[PDB]
A = this chain, B = another copy of it.
C-alpha cells in the first residue's frame, strides 16, 4: 500500500510504516574523569547481520571504546 496522497496544506507531516528516533543534549560537567578497562575475549565467531539499518552515532563491533561521545 503506502499511498500517502496530499492536495494542499502548509507544514503537514505524514509518516507511514517506518522507525524514528530523536534525542537531546548530553552535557556532563566535572573536574576529573578517570577510566580503567581490561577486556579479554570479546568475540569468538560471532556472526552478525544488518539490512536497512541506521544509527546516529559511531557504529562498531567488538570494541573497547573507553570514552564515547
Contact = CB atoms under 8 A, between A and B. Distances in A.
Nearest to A52: B52
Copies of this chain present in the complex amount to 3
Given A5-B5, A30-B31, A37-B36, A18 B16 contact: yes
Interface in A10-45: 10-45
A49 to B, nearest CB: 5
Contact of A38 (B10, B38, B56): B38
18 contacts: A2-B4, A3-B3, A6-B12, A23-B24, A29-B30, A30-B30, A33-B33, A38-B39, A39-B39, A42-B62, A42-B64, A43-B43, A44-B46, A45-B45, A47-B48, A61-B62, A64-B65, A68-B68
